[PDB]
Structures are given as C-alpha cells and as structure tokens.
Amino acid sequence: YYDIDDVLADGTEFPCKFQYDIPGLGYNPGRPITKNTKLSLPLWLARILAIVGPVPFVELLPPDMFSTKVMNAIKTDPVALDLHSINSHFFSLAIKWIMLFSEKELANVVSELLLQRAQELNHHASSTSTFLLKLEEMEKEIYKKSHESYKDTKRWMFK
C-alpha cells in the first residue's frame, strides 16, 4: 500500500522453500526450480505465494527474526533489546507474518514488549542517551509525535 513502510515491509527476503517445481525461475537458468528448493523471498510475493494451491506453493520456513532464541531473548530485557538491530522493521512486519501464519502465542508475547518499550519511551517525553538508537523505525516515529507534542507544549508553556 501507499505507506513506504508497507512496501518496505514486503521487501525483506524470507527463507521459504517451494512446494512445487517451478519452470521459468524468476531469479537463474533452472529453468524450473526443483520442489522444496529453500530460498528467501520478498514478503509481498511470499504473502500469497503458498496462498494458492489445494496444497500451498511454498513450504514457507519460519523467520530467524522469529527464532525461539529471539522470542525468548525478548522475554529478558526488551528495553535492552535493539529492534533497530533485529530487522529493524518488526511490529509492522511480524504482524504480517503473525497475520500470515495466524499464531496467537508470540502475539500474547510481543505485544507486551511493544508496551514495555512504550512506558520508557514515555520517559523520553521529557526534555539522552544511547537507547534512542535501538528503536525500530515505526518504533522510532512514535517518539517524533510525542517529542514535538511536549516540545510545542513546553514552548507553549511560556510566552
């Protein structure tokens, strides 16, 4: 869709092996790619790739960003975790996969992390140091709204 991040969300390569042989390799001279060839794929294509069958066209292996080592690591110190490092496009992204695979488990998990970041990021509302760098872009923008919110507020405060 029209948000740069929307198309930006589909751009990252996703390591999904196909269910079928595919003559006319889009990437090269297979020409067909043998069934269960493991390859990273852009989300947009991969979005509907296995969506058509009735068996799905791609096995669609789960993201390393979603690794159990990731999902547990976040359980420790999300405040300390660098989301700018992980993807960095994540919540706007993972929601797609979580929309894609339709799992509730990490959802009940990650959403809280979103809050955990939020609480402290609310501390940033006051007017640094190094934490600001680890924020995701969508996670980064949120502050712009808040920073200027009080900025004009305090600048409004006097004269």
Place this chain on the structure above:
Amino acid sequence: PDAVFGDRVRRFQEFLDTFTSYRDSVRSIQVYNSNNAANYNILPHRIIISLDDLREFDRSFWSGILVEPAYFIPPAEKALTDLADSMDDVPHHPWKLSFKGSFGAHALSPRTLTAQHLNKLVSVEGIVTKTSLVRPKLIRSVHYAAKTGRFHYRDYTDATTTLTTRIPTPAIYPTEDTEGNKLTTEYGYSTFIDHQRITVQEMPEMAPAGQLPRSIDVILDDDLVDKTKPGDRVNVVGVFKSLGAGGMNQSNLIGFKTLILGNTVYPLHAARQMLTDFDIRNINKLSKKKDIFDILSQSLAPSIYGHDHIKKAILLMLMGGVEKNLENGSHLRGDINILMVGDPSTAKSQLLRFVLNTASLAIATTGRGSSGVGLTAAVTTDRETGERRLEAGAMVLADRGVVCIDEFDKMTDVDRVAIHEVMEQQTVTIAKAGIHTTLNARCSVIAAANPVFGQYDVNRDPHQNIALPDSLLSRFDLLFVVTDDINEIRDRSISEHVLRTHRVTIPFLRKYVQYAKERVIPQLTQEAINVIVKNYTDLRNDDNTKKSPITARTLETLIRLATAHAKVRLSKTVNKVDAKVAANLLRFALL
C-alpha cells in the same frame, strides 16, 4: 534457616521437575559415575541449566537470580544435591549449575561493568589473559587422637567461599583437640579444591576507538579450573564478587578488588564444532569431486585476483601435512611454512588476514616483535607467592595453529635464530634464570617480506633479494615472489572486481577442512614416488642451472604437498595423481 531459604528450595520442586529434562541428565551423570565404578573395580557434579524455564516458572525468581543470585542460588544448590540423593540414594559435593542463558542484562562485556552490575550473575566475555596458574586448596580437615583414638574433624571457609559473604574463619589448622592428644594431619578423608584465578580482557574487535583494553579477573575452581588455555575467546557468566576491605579494615584511598565467580564460561569461536550428518555429507558429497579443489582455491580470494597457485598452497598447509614421528628417533617436520615476497602493494599482508580468519589458531606477527615472541621471556620475578612462573609467548601459544608474519624481513635476527629452533627443530627451548625446559612448538607458520631494494625485485637477482640469509631460505618450503608488473590487459581485469569490491561457501570450508584434519591421513604410496623421484632429481638436474636453493628438504616438502592434496581429496591413501599438483605448484614454485 529462614523458610525463605527452605521455600525457595521448596520453590524448586516442580522445577526442575518441569522442565524435567535435567532430572535424568543428572541421572545420566549418576549412571556414568556408576559406569566408571563398574570398570575400575569422571564427570563433574555440576550441571547445565537453561535459565529460560524461570520465565515460564517464576519471573520474580527469574530476575532475582539476576538480581540477588546470592540468595536464590544456595537453596537451588541444595535441591539439586538433595534430589541427587533421591535420584540415586542406593549406592554407598557442589553440584553446580551453569545457565547458558537465557540472557540478559547482565549481557555486558568486561570493559563496561558495574557499579550496578556488581553482586549479580552476569555473562562477560573476551580474551583469557593472563590466566594465573592453578594451586590446590583445602576445605575440610580430619585427625586421629592417640592413644584414645576416634577421629578428628575440621571445616574451612575462605573469602571466595560459596557465593555470599560469611564470617571469616581462618583456623590455622586443627591440632591437639581436647582431650589434649597429639593430632596428626589426615588427608584424602579431608576435602580439597585446586584453585585458579584468571583475568579477561575485552575484545579489541569490540574495543572503542582510542583506548586500551582492561582485563578483569575471575576465579576458577574444581572443574572450572583449567577448562581453557590463556588467550582464548570465551564468555564467562557468574555473579560479580566485591569481597575485601576499602582500607577501613585497618584504621589509617583506592579499594575493593573485585571479580566474577562461576559459572559457565562457554568457550567461543569467532572451534568447535558440531558437524551432524547433513553437513558432513556435503563434505562426503564434495569429496567425490576432483573438481572441488580449484573451487576450494577460488573461494579463498573473494576480493583477490588469481595467485590461485599461491592459494592452493594455503589449504594444503591447513591439512597439517601428516606428521609422522620416528619410533625412538627424531620426527621430520610435518607442517609447511611459506613466505610471501614481492614489490610493495602486493596484498600479501592482505592475504594473511584471510589466513587470519577461517584459520582458527593462530596469532600473526608484524615485523618486531619480541622480546622472544613465543618466548615466555621468563615471567618474573615470582608472581606469585614467590613462585617463578613462565608464561608462553605467541609462538608457543600458537602451537597446533597458524603463524602469519608481516614485515618478516624487518624483524630482528636475534629471534630469527630461535625461529630455526622454531621451524627446523619445531620445538621451544628455554633456559633463562630460571626454569629449564624444551617444549613443543609445532605451529604452522607463514611470513611476508619486501624486496631488499626498491622495485628491482624483478631485475636484480633473487639472491641478495632474499634480505634474510641464509638457512632462513632452506626453512620455508615455498617462497613466492610477487611481481608488481602491470598490464593494461591485467588492469582491465583489475578494475571491475576492484569496482565490484566497493559495492563454495567460506564457513563451510573450515568445517570441511577441520574434519579433514583428523580424518583421514593418507599415509604414503610408492606410486606417487615413482614420478617424483625422477621429478626432484631432475629438479636438481635442471633448476641448479636456473635457480636455487635446491635441497632434499624441498623434496621432503613434496611428501608434505602430496600429503595435503591426499587430504584435499580426502583419500584414505596417497596417489601419484596428487604429485602432479604439488610438482606443478612446485613448477610454479620455480615459475
């Protein structure tokens, strides 16, 4: 004891009952412990636990161990040993827990530490240096009172005892216990722990811009002792101990010597390694091809043009060359050593960085250098308790590994004479004050040197162009001169890849080679001999009218070279087919 201690133990029931995977693992220890009991008429008590379960168990008990492990831990210590009793109580003792993590906060490197991170179990990683050597330490004591008999008993607690602070109780040592009978020291019934202490420097890779690294200490006890040599890359995890006075201990500035105790300290490669099946089968699949080796060659120079013959020699050096030691006689040198030479901007030193990475052992060298390089240089005086302790230099520290040398020509000849001892003899010899020993350095080695004078490395004769006479020439199995000669046809090739520079898999290689190292040595086959005998002889029969030096040592390399390719082929036996490869690079060695 507070139920807070008894409850935390009681709080550890359902865990590790769930996850119960550790329950039988300790039982797996129980059995093997029983196993050894079966044969003799070895495993450490301490067990690994992924911290993670606490997040599915107690998040308060979770972070608390990260907060006040000093408290939560000791009860967890009991239940393990306690259940350890229940696990096997039939037949007639720290039982520590590691925690890989499940991190972290508490994830920090040594360069950035505390004051808050103090008194908390934390992962910290880096070089192992300088790693104080081990000494034995008692805890329990026992005695006999004659003539009334019975048996005496005594316990001890130091400053580094357990985890938490406890009342210091140096006892001297138990004697004449009432009634006043003579008490003879009794041992082996009494308890002992060999003690170890080491610091660790933070990585220069992760080191900041303009500042020096600060290595920080950690205690090593029981199995924790001697798990690793000094200089290693490893991540230590444990609570940070602040014990000791601030000068207040004696009424009268700086204060509080401090270090982390325990726990895991997982060795880290940045060897090891896991292999499995799928992976090694690629090795098993790739091994069949005789076409693989050039691929092995081409993968070596991602940024580098050609010199593939120079490349081929590198992997053949990775093989090790199949050391064969004489029975009750001296071994001939197994491994191969080489030196890159040629006009400036060769990217020879650049190549060493490639030699510097996947190689995994070992340290390189740029010119000077010393005093001693791999020499211990007699670490002294004392250090500690009046005890003289040598600490091996890089050349020793690099044993069973790679040695790269930059500016080898600039290096002082003083230690060069030692490099004769370093290379031909392939062992270290030491007498200084001092300790008197000869220790093995078999380390694989390579160096690099500029032309003696200017760009004339082409025109002027290669002799007088060596820059480091004489036997130094005999030592190296290969010396490749790099001509700086330029061609527009060449430069045209030189551009785009240099252009693509700014804008088959490598890691698979070192796994392919590492397993290729212990399996399997090709030994020897006369068929390889049949052609090479006419070869090397003919080499002395021709080359001596062309170049030099020419020695049987160069012939000895032929066995090394073919030995390596036989490994490159993963051949269980040598083949004459490999010699043509070695001879050709040896042809390229001359030309």
Place this chain on the structure above:
Amino acid sequence: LEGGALVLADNGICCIDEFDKMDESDRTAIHEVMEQQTISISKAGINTTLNARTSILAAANPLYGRYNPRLSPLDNINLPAALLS
C-alpha cells in the same frame, strides 16, 4: 658456579654447528681448546685453568650463499686460518 660445554665435554667428543656464528668469544676459547687439556678463566676472583680433554668436531657453512667453485679455498671459508691450521 655451573660450568658446561667444553668443561662438560672434556674427555669426549663435542659436536658443533653454526661454527661461524660462535663469533670471537667462542673462537678464542676453542682456539685455546686446540691448545687443549685446559680451560682458562682469569675472570672475577677466578684464576683457574681447568682441563678440557674434549674431542672436537664442528661442521660449518661456506660464505654466502653457498660455495662458489670460482671462489678460491680460504676465501670461501668463514673461519680464521690459524683456526683451520
């Protein structure tokens, strides 16, 4: 004091390498070791001359890089004439 080498090798053969690199300090000693049956130290308060019965053999390398047939004898050798005599 701890002696060795020549003092240790006395009444027996002494094998030797890098004989050209033994420099002067060795040469004069073995120069005297050719006078044999003696080792002379006037150093410190030590005035002693101790018997060295050592059998002597050392192999040494020709002038760099290797010997040149055009090179005349004794020009090729790196050792002193009185040492070879």
Place this chain on the structure above:
Amino acid sequence: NTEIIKSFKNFILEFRLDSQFIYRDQLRNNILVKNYSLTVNMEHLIGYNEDIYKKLSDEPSDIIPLFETAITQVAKRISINSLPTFQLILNSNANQIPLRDLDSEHVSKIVRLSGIIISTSVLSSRATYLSIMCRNCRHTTSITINNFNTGNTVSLPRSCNCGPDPYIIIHESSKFIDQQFLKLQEIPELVPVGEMPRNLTMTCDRYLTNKVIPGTRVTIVGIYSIYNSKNSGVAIRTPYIKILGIQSDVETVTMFTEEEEEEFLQLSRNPKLYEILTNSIAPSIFGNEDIKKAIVCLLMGGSKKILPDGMRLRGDINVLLLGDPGTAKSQLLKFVEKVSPIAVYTSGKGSSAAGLTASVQRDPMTREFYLEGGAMVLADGGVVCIDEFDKMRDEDRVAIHEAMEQQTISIAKAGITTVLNSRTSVLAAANPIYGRYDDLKSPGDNIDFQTTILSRFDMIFIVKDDHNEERDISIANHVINIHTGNANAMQNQQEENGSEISIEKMKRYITYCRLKCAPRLSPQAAEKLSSNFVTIRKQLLINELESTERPITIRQLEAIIRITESLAKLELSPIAQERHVDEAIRLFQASTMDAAS
C-alpha cells in the same frame, strides 16, 4: 547545620526565574532518565541567595552531602525505593585559575580550571552503603559513606568484648559506586617557563567517570586538598583535588544537540559548501590550494568497508609535504592539529617524548606488564602530523610501513603479544634531500633510497617554490597584512559575517559528518575511473617504455577511491556523484605530476 537543607529545597522549589524555574524541572527531567544527577549553575546559585553561596564556599565539602540527600527529598516526593542518592554537579565559568599556582590556602576551596589530562585510572568501586556484623556478638549493623573528600575516613567500630572491632564487611548487602582517578596536566602554552609542566591527579566519581577522553583539553572545577597516603614529611601529605563539577569545553562525545544538524543542513545546502572550506583552512596562508584542497579530503575520514570476508578498506590514506623550507608545511600541520578534534603533531624522532612506536613498559609495583602507549594509539581513528619523516630512524620507521595499511599493531614484548587496532590517518611532511636538484634527479632517490616508502603513501606533494615577482609580492604584502594592525585578522570577521568557516564549529561539523554519512559510489563513477587509470596505468608505462625510473600501484587507484567518498562526504550524499568524481581525477593528476617530474 540542619534545616539549611530546605533553603536549597526552597531554591529547589521556591525559585523561579521567569518564566520557568530550572533545577526543579531538571530533577523530574532526570527522574524518568533515572539519571540520579543534577548539574548546578553556581554563578546562578548566588543569584538566589548571596549568603549561602559563600556560606557554602566556606566549607563546600561539608555541605556537599547537604544537597543530594536533600535533592532526593522532593525527588522522593516526585518518586511517590530503592532510591540511590543522586549525583549533583555544580559548575562555574567565572574566574579561571592557572595550574602553575596552587596555594595551600585553596584547600577546601572550590576552583574552576582549564586543564589538559595526561590520563585516567581504570574504574574502581566505593561502597556508598554497607552492612556489618560482629564476628563474635552476632550483632547486626550497617554503615554508609554518604560523602567523602581515601582518608581513610571511617573504619570498623570496636564496640559490639566483643573486640577489637568484631564488626565485619558484608558486600552483598552493601552498595557501591566508582571513581576514575584522573591525572590532569596544565596547558603546555603557559607558563612552564624552562621548567617541565606540572601534572595533577583529579578525582572523578560515579557519573564524573568515563566523561572525558584521555589527553583532551578540558575545563574543570573542584576542591584543593591533601592526602597523607603512604603507598614526604615530616608528616607531609601529597596534593590531590576533587573534581566538581567538570564542565568541559565541548565536545571536547558522539552525541550533540539537534538544531546543530539543521545549521549544518544550511551548510550542506550551500553550493560552495566545499569551496568555502578551501579558504577556511588557510586564513593566514596564501596559495597551494591544491595541497590545501588535498587536506580536507583526508579530514573527513577514510573508507571503512568491513563486509565479508574480514578484509577491510583503510583510512585515511597517506600524504607527503616534501619541499624546500618556506613550504610552511610544518606551519600547515600546526593548523592541521588545531583543526582535528583528535590529532597528534609529530616532528620527530617522535613528538614530543612520545614513542613513534607504541611500545611496552612494565608496571613498577607488582612487576607485571602493560602497553605504555603510542602516538598511533593516542590519536587512533584520527589525524597524524609528521615532520622530519626523512630524519626518522628507519627501524621504527619500519613500524610506520605497517601502521598505515593493516592499521593494527602487535608486539610480543614480555608476555603480552596482543594486536592493537590503529585507524589513524597519517600524513608525512618530511623535507626532500638537497633542495631543488632532487627534482632535477629522479622523483625518487629522496625518501630512504627506495620508493617503497612512497608505495605506502598515497598523495605525495613536491612543493615547487618559484621566485615569481608578482606571485611573491602578492603574499609578500599578504604577510605584512597578517601583522599589526592584524588587517588580515579583521578580514575574517566579514568572512565570518558573510560566509567563511569558523573552523571550530567546522570541526564539530566534520565530527558530525564523519559519523553521519556512509557514501557508496555510484556504479558509473567507477567505470569512469576504471577507464581512467587503465589509461594512466598504460600511459605511465609508456613513460616506462624508456625504462625511466621513478610510482604506480593498484593501491594508487584505491587511494583515489577514498577521495571519491572524501569530498562526497562533505556533500553528505548517500552515494558518490559521477560529476563529483572528476575533480578527484584532475586533483590526483596534479599528484601524479609529482611522479611526472
């Protein structure tokens, strides 16, 4: 004594400078931060109460604890556990004092001062709180160091038989802090006379620590005092000084204010943004703009390419100032050091006592060993100025050959063999041999003998000073104008007013820039260049067809490549321009000309 607390608490609350009060703001501002800190303006403090300032100034050390224990009070109001005491830093810029004069009178007197630090100690703990128990009575107690001037100030009380002082340390329950132990030296300019500059150990605690890079020019405040120690007399104590606060001239520190980016954006928009810097480097200097221009390209930092494998592009290049005296190149580098945020001026030999080789030195006590430091390490990741490079001893001169490329030094001295990282950008000013005639000679036959020394160098400049009448009289008078009434110096104001760089801000600009953009060349620039040097590679060999001896390397081209990002970095653009590249060609062509001679 007591209740003087509320008076600060009053100024903590009662104070409002219109329209908005500060420190009360700063507190909550630090609250969510968990900063646990306050920076006080002392010159501001007098504005509140005239009495308490000097009332504080009388024995400031004793009223130190009267603050942070007070600041927590309403902070605790605002907090509504555990809550460690905040760290206050008061500061003043008003009367700066020379290091040359420290009078015992100044003991327990707060003094703001400029300074140049030699170094600082590795951090060590101090326990702000501790629990302690009788080794006998089983009696439970707790103690704190609430504040301190090291004394040692406190010890174990001996009143629990049981004794003596049976109470003992408990570290787990105890809570801790840190100290830097800075060693600061006076500014070299004045007033050492013929005597060597005094050096002083400054005490940094908690937040004070890690706040300053070693060797940096800094302004600091704190209290004069003396510690007996032992490790003097009769009964004489060694001098030491508290650091509070230290407000140091920025940076002198990766972070900066946001509006700075914008004012730079104003600079980034300028079409002359590069060309104005061409003038800024040489306010007093006249001509040699090419070499003058060749300065800036190195100023922005070299190409760092770390992508696998571990092979990485280096920085920043190499440059040679060689030419007859009257080149003003040594005078040039003196400007160079001033322009670099971190740089080392070296005319040696070494400079001044510094080992041109970073070298090993033993610890006096407890034996052991450590890196003694080296100029490459001192300035690492920054500018390098070198004079007498031809006068350099060739042995450690060898180490230079390594230092420039691999950019990592390693020594086996003693037991510590570790390989240090050196990212510095060196520039060689060494004077050519025999004046003019060496140009009548080969371009070589100057540095050492071999040009292999030149091989490691990138842009090497041979100054040709020609005696042209009009050319001299221009700068000739330009010289007099440099002098009283400093007519040229007043010209910069209008240049400061209208356009021209202030160069201290520019340093911040560069430091801004150096960390900001990572320019990657456009694909067509390279092919434009690939087609370029292949000619140059082919052409100079056509000069080599005569067997003429002088030179060329593929490293020669790579150096040029770093020029691509060089000015482009000034542009701030993500990728190198096609057009942008060309000036690098003709500029390096002027460098190639030196080979042409």
